[model samples]
Target: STGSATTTPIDSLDDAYITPVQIGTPAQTLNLDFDTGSSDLWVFSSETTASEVDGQTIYTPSKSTTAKLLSGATWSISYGDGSSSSGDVYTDTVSVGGLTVTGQAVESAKKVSSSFTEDSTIDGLLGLAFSTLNTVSPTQQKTFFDNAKASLDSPVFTADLGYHAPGTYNFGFIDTTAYTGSITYTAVSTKQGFWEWTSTGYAVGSGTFKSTSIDGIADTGTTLLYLPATVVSAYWAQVSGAKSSSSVGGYVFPCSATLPSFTFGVGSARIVIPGDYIDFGPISTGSSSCFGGIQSSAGIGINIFGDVALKAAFVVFNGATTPTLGFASK
Candidate 1:
């Protein structure tokens, strides 16, 4: 069996890629962020507090005859961005692209943080991380991909993520046409429930590539590239008038600065992030200052290779016996 889905940027923020998903018997359609950082399929629902619900569409499990409540089970999750959701659980039919899985655990949110409540367009999160990372209490839940893996042609998925446009998430099959050249593969450590891998090193501009190993997570949920403090500082040093600001948070540089491209060593292959991509965007409307997409991951402990980095390459999340990550320049 083969499954694939396309995702579009929300409000042109280019922060996350969202796909339409169908849940329950009659199929309540919802727009969900296909996140690889965490594991859980949750949505705002009838159980959500009316005051907390903004323009987000809620999933009414009661309306689906096939929806079954998982009694005594509950789920709550918080993201690094401080957004969170929590509520009861239900077993229902969930479909993504052409693949459908029955008895999938669907978390119904009864409460949500302002970060989520304010984002009216996002109905929920569809996590693609390892099922072991699921947060359901009593018993964990399996992801839609995991439950549907057995029937897949290949236990792999390709994240053909693009900037300012739509991307495709291909499941059970890899359409090589999406990527160019050979895919450089690297082993991923699932010990932390993340697609964690070590980069040989990185360089600012065309500077010398460091030999030190850098550990980071390839996270789709995160919008920025978070690196070690030292690496972040080194990158900013190349840009004149760039500095960290408490008021703006992270590093901000002059909008006209001639920024150089950044490179990360993946095995012997190198993935380069264009300078324009690193510029992120304006700090605020009409502000001459711009926020640097690369920031320090100090508080988060682990570095994150978010959209800025991923968009530069075609990524393959291979779920073979030993999970591997394959990357190729787009």
Candidate 2:
């Protein structure tokens, strides 16, 4: 069995990747962020405190005849950015595109951070990372991909994310037409419950690549590309009027300044991010200074090859027994 679905950016900055997922028997459709950086399929639901809920579509377990409460089961998770959520658990039929998983564990939110409540565009998060990262206590649960792997034509999924446009996510098969050239495969470390990999080197625009090793995670949920301080500082130096501003935080530059494309080596492949993608919108509305899509990972702890980097290539999250990652130019 296989499935295919389109993912969309909720904003011009591509702040979040939203994919439609159907849950429960009657199928309550919710637009959720398919986050590869974390685990646990949590949602804004009827179980949530009404005052904390905003414009999000909530999953009503009570309305679904197929829903079953996971008695005494509970879960909680906090993002690297400090946002968090906690709730009880329920089992229901969850489907994405044509792929369906019966009795999938669905976390019903009782409480959520203010950041989650403020973001009306996102209803919840569907984690795509290793199931080992799931936070359900006493009895852990598998993720959608993990649950569906056995029935899938191939235990894999590919992310072909786009810029300010809709992109496709294919499950169980790789669409050869989605990318160009051959894919470069790299070993993955699922030990961290993430699709973590090592990068060979990096080049700032047309500059020669600096032969340095960089470790990071391919996080589709994150918005920006975060690298080592050394790499981020070097890239900003090339910009005509860039500065590492403490007031606004991170790096910013004149809005009109042309940014150089960023390239990183993965296996033998070099993924080039377009210069336009580097300009991560303005610091403030109507401000002449624009934020950068690439920033230092110092405060973040780990480098994140987020949507900025993923959008530049066709990425395959290979889920075979011996997991690997594939990257191809688009």
Candidate 3:
């Protein structure tokens, strides 16, 4: 089996890419973020307070004949920055693109953070990462991908996120036309319940490649590309008027700065991020100081190759017995 879904960025900043997923018997459609950083497919639901939801669609399990209670099961998920949502669980026939999973666990949010309530673009999140990271308690449940992998023609999924434009998330088999050149494959470590891989090196603009292995996770859920402090410092140092601001809470630069393209190693292959992407838009609604997309991951403990990096390349998350990652320039 195979599937393809349109992944649309909600804002010009490409803060999040949301895809439509069909849930329940009649198939209620909800725009959900296909998050690879975490592993629990959750949604805003009728079980929550009316004031907690804004313009986003809510999943009402009571309306679905296919819904079944996962008695005694509950879950709570928190982001790296500390926002959270908690809820009970329900099992239903869930489908995304053309792929369907019978009895998939659907976390119904009973409580949500103010940030989630304010964002009307996203109705929920569908986690595509390893199921071990799932927050469900009592007994953990498999992620949608994990549940459907065995039925898929190929045990893999691919993410192609565009800059403001609509991209695609494909499952089962890869679409050759989606990318250019041959894919560069690398071993992945699932021990940490993430699609963790090591980047061989990096280079700034026209600078020579520095041979250093950088460990990070391929996280579509996050907004920015976060790396080691020294690497981030090196990239920013090249830009005039750029500074690590305590007030801005990150490295910021003039909006008009001719930022350097970022390059990271996947095997010996180099995937280059365009300079315009590095200038992560204005710091405020009309501020001249733009926040850098590439920031320090020092305090976060783990580096994250988020949407900022993923948008520049086509990524294949291989789920074979020995997991692997495939990168291709698009």
Candidate 4:
């Protein structure tokens, strides 16, 4: 057992962590991260703990009622930020949102990066993004949602990111009262699950907010809003006393004098980002400069369009019911 299978009552479920999900027919537990940024369900096992494994959550066989390991099955994962892990396969009794599952296929990590040395409070992530990133190969068999989808209260899963709040991560159904009566919606066939739009233009300053083209994805997993290089510069252009410094990851800026307001345009819907979202955290720069929600990721291929831009708004990723994402007031 990774920790304990006694099934003791948790003190508070406010803290959201990835729950162990059952994979196949018999069912087995695998550590999973419920990431909206990327869509894929994966786990760590004995084979993964063999080498460079550290800090990641592990599944203890004792805590599991039904579990197994697949011999000779090689699995590996490489993160975009230059991190990776590799290992064989193993299984265990997986549980999620108080649901237990058996015979789940999982990838055990043989090697992991030093950054991953600390145990994550959540064992593994259960990817809830769109279908584009599902790692389940036809031959591998079974996805975490394949079985649970039918039994779920709703076909949708909502993330009420209290933004480091003490609230627990929600699963299955959303408490409708949490948001305003009407939710904004977009019919997306692409990755823009809930994003209003992609980057087309920018107004930059407090003068007036203009709507840009809507072609973005509403990803809860992504922490920051990524804009196009041109749009990013245009935004900084409006900062009153905005001073640019390279020491701050080339993103440090002083906007105390130049507080700017920006808006994103979905197809027809437009959302605004207040100064707080832009100046979220402190900069590492020598000066007391802070960063705006619109930072620079010039060369990064993907435009994050993160949640900071969608504050006070209810975002819904209707994975099971509707192919499109739904949003309302929060």
Candidate 5:
């Protein structure tokens, strides 16, 4: 790993996927979903000509009384899922709970449309996904991570993802209690910011995949962990008493047998995922015949080691000082 030390704060309008912030006199707290995929931070804007979307947090510019608009350049974004938003880019003194990073850039979008748009509890997404896949990069726009690299504490950020609960989403610092192990670091592929990884393949309750050669990427934006069809079928075959259940999404299984444990090898560093991760009791959606845990990818080609899998380890991504990935307790 390159010996780079992180110390300092970032300052740029382009690099953003929000950090949480507090607003108003008493300082109300909220977690801003920052995104590198998009450079704009749109909490429910107080001046929003339109009403607030469901599940989206609406921020009142009047309350904070510090939001400033970046004039001269206009911004617009269209998502892969038929979502879009447009507005002015601006900077303001932004606060995420106790941490306040001044001069933060955000997009005060006048219009927005999405599945979550109907929800009131939602604020907005920070867009830290990746620039290559982002809708905002076509015009040579700088990403929030790119602009804020210098301001971030060390330009190094860690995504401490957790399993099936709110307590899991820790960032900025690697939380060791989240995952158990030595902090093994790896070199990240240069290009865009992504956890592109090599794997030792899949196994049944810890058994190996037939041919052994299988690998994939780890993405937090995605909700589920996915695997190649071949590996998934083979792994399911080893579930002692488990029986497959069919649902709208794919396959779900049930069994009284003890689930097997498995390991994901990232280069020389490896993360072990426990078996209870397979306990897919019926979700609130009532998709009864759902998977106990692992979901089928319908031959999506590459295995997607999503958030569920990420929760089992500590993940660190280097942007500023040096680009490296470190994984610890999940």
Candidate 6:
């Protein structure tokens, strides 16, 4: 059996994609971010303080007869941007698409950071990373994919992310119609509980490819592609009047700047990001300045192939023994 779901970009920000999921006996539905960077299925719930939540739907365990509390179990997670959420735990039947998993751990948030609280749209996060990264204490929780893998025909899921449009996530089966050309496979390092892999090299515009090692994680929750400081500078240098501004937060250039295409080497396959896609958006409304989508991963320990990079290709996250990453042009 296979479980499939639809994902859509959230507004003009292009920060994250959300999918609908049902939980418990009565089936309370919630829109969750299908995140690959972390492993914990957490949601804003009735346990949260009223002052902390605004204009967002909250999960209510009391409304579901099948919901059971996991005594003394607690969870808390902090993101790369310092955004965080923490709460108590409940076990209930969770369903996505046509597939259902009984007794799945559902973390109910009692507290949240301003970043999550202010953005009222995202009700929760559905982590797809390895079970080892789950934030639950005493006993780590298993994700929906992990719990349902054995019942699947193939232990894999494909991420088909679109640019500010609707996409689909397929589990237990791969949709041939989702991608074109052949899928290029690369080995994944499971040491960090992330889909971590190394890019053979990269090139700016039509420049020659540099054979430098770039190790990073394929993170769907992240909004931008973060690369080494040197690589970010090299790419931005090509644009006229491009400069890193502390005020604007990252590299900014004239809105009319003719940006060059960027390409990353995946094994022998090359995934290219169109020049126009590199310009995230205007720094402010009616502003002639734009922020570069490719930024420096200075403070972060590793680079991240976030939404900017993933949207350019079709990615398959294999949960098999080798845990490989398959990428192809969309």
Candidate 1 lDDT, 280-304, residue by residue in tens: 6789888899889899999988999
Clashes of each: 0, 0, 0, 50, 56, 0
lDDT of 6 by residue, 1-330 (tens): 898899988887577898999998899989999999999999989998788898778889999999999999999999988899999999999998878999999999999998888988899999999999999999998999999999999999889888878888888998988888989999899999999999888999999999888999999999899999999999999999999999988899999988999999888888999887787778989999998999999988899999889989999999998899989997
**Candidate 1 total steric clashes:** 0
- As a whole number from 0 to 100, the lDDT of residue 28 in candidate 5 is 44
Clashing pairs in 1: none
lDDT of 5: 0.53
Candidate 1 stretches greater than 4 Å from native: none
Give lDDT tens digits, candidate 3, residues 1-330: 999999999988899999999999799999999999999999999987789999999999999999999999999999997778999999999998999999999999999999899899999999988999999999899999999999999999999999769999999999999999999999899989999999999999999999899999999999999999999999999999999999888999998899999999999999999998777788888999999999999889999999999999999999999999999999
CA lDDT, candidate 1, residue 314: 90
Ten-residue segment with the worst summed lDDT in candidate 1?
Answer: 9-18
**Candidate 4, residue 80: lDDT:** 46
Give me the overall lDDT of model 3.
0.94
lDDT of the candidates, in the order given: 0.90, 0.93, 0.94, 0.52, 0.53, 0.91
Task: List per-candidate RMSD values in Å.
Answer: 1.2, 0.8, 0.7, 6.2, 7.0, 1.1
Write down the worst ten-residue block by lDDT for model 2: 274-283
Q: Which pairs of residues collide in candidate 3?
A: none
Candidate 6 has its poorest 10 consecutive residues by lDDT at 8-17
- TM-scores for all candidates? 0.97, 0.99, 0.99, 0.73, 0.72, 0.97
Over all chains combined, what TM-score does candidate 4 have? 0.73
**What is the per-residue lDDT of model 2 for residues 239-305, given as tens digits with 9 covering 90 to 100?**
9989999998799999999999999999767999988988887899999999999999998889999
Q: Give me the runs in candidate 3 sitting further than 4 Å from their true place.
A: none
